[PDB]
Design a protein around this ligand. Structure first.
Ligand SMILES: CC(=O)Nc1ccc2c(S(=O)(=O)O)cccc2c1S(=O)(=O)O
Lengths: 214, 215
């Protein structure tokens, strides 16, 4: 199957900037390629077809070019509507195949997160399970590393996290991580901590509490 | 004028099958191949196959040959995709697509979990949660099924500083979500904080006051 290799995977850029996205094919597809845009709401729109032709519904700041197995999507001057995900699709061969996508996000300066830790509620503890929550608030860029420790023991595989969409007013991200232990385990240990690293932090930030102590 | 109409969301049990519809309009149905595309949550696009409605001919992705069935009903200008022996790996948005026009997609969730409203737990403001003049507080909306949940604060009167996170799917098969807000640590004695939690799929609403209090 013809593999489409897209780059970059993620791109950060500013309003007004010129950018190009690339899609490379494992075999010759002779121009049979389109560029698709997927909005943060999921909707998918074609911008370019036949490698270089503008979709009747797409604005003129989008151009397509190619040379051999290298296909590029260019945005002449970025607008807010353009921060979205982009995919290439080939239609020279079966099966039809797509590039892995490029995520285009708005570039801003580095902002260190504000970090907060929350112990399990008494209400939850009554029923057998303990959830510990670490909040990383309004940071940039999106990459952030959260480690959980229990009595200074590094934890692995018992946490889940999620990240918000880039903020419309300040272009930051926030992150929530939940550490799940059974109540029995939770009550067998004292010190609960979340250790955060981020481009914006010159040294790791650790927020911690001791169980059962206000 | 060209339009593709798909169902909204569907829950299906593992080992069961799903049959999705795509009603076409604004062009001659038999004149364009109808394709199906899959997208796992936070993942990219994958091609399943196509059907030519003029003659019923198909072409499939090997990966789906063994379990996908494509048909059409030319009288109603509808294409169908049946996918069987479903597993959690088949949870995804499915799109029908013809040249130049993409459907809105249908979200399919494969799960043996039963409907369950959430337990709402306070994320109480504390010293271990108070950056200078700012305190963070929240609600943990745990162990509900299926999606979605919505959260508001003080009936949408409180919006600045609110962050309601995407839920995660826990190993139990139930979802868990948090919603936080940052507020002045000095307001914690003059103002009440309540998260407004609604789980439409179980028609459940929960309103929980989030307190510092004594300890
Ligand atoms: C010959 C030709 O134009 N083929 C094309 C062109 C574009 C297509 C699109 S797109 O419009 O979303 O890029 C989506 C699905 C199929 C497409 C095909 S084909 O697989 O039906 O042949």
């Amino acid at each position: 199957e013809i593999q489409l290799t897209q780059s970059p995977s993620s791109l950060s850029a500013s309003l007004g900037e010129r950018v190009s996205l690339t899609c490379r094919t494992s075999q010759e597809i002779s121009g049979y390629l389109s560029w698709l845009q997927q909005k943060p709401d999921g909707t998918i729109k074609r911008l370019i077809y036949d490698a270089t032709k503008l979709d009747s519904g797409a604005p003129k700041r989008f151009s397509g070019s190619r040379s051999g197995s290298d296909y590029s999507l260019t945005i002449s001057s970025l607008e807010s509507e353009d921060f979205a995900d982009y995919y290439c699709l080939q239609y020279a061969s079966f099966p039809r195949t797509f590039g892995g996508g490029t995520k285009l996000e708005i570039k801003r300066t580095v902002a260190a997160p504000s970090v907060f830790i929350f112990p399990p509620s008494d209400e939850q503890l009554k029923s057998g399970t303990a959830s510990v929550v670490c909040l990383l608030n309004n940071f940039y860029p999106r990459e952030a590393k959260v480690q959980w420790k229990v009595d200074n023991a590094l934890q692995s595989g018992n946490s889940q996290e999620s990240v918000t969409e880039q903020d419309s007013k300040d272009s930051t991200y926030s992150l929530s991580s939940t550490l799940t232990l059974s109540k029995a385990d939770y009550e067998k240990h004292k010190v609960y901590a979340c250790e955060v690293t981020h481009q914006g932090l010159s040294s790791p930030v650790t927020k911690s509490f001791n169980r059962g102590e206000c | 004028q060209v339009q593709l109409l798909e169902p909204g969301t569907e829950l299906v049990k593992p080992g069961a099958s799903v049959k999705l519809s795509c009603r076409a309009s604004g062009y001659s149905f038999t004149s364009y191949w109808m394709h199906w595309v899959k997208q796992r949550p936070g993942q990219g696009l994958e091609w399943i196959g196509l059907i030519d409605p003029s003659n019923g001919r198909t072409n499939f992705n090997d990966k789906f040959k063994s379990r996908a069935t494509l048909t059409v009903d030319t009288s109603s200008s509808t294409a169908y995709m049946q996918l069987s022996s479903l597993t959690s790996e088949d949870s995804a948005v499915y799109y029908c697509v013809r040249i130049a026009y993409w459907g809105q997609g249908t979200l399919v969730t494969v799960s043996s979990a039963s409907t369950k409203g959430p337990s709402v737990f306070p994320l109480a403001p504390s010293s271990k949660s108070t950056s200078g003049g700012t305190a963070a507080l929240g609600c943990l909306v745990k162990d509900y099924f299926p999606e979605p949940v919505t959260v508001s604060w003080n009936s949408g009167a409180l919006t600045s500083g609110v962050h309601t996170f995407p839920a995660v799917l826990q190993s139990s098969g139930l979802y868990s979500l948090s919603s936080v807000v940052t507020v002045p640590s000095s307001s914690l004695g003059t103002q009440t904080y309540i998260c407004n939690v609604n789980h439409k799929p179980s028609n459940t609403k929960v309103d929980k006051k989030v307190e510092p209090k004594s300890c």
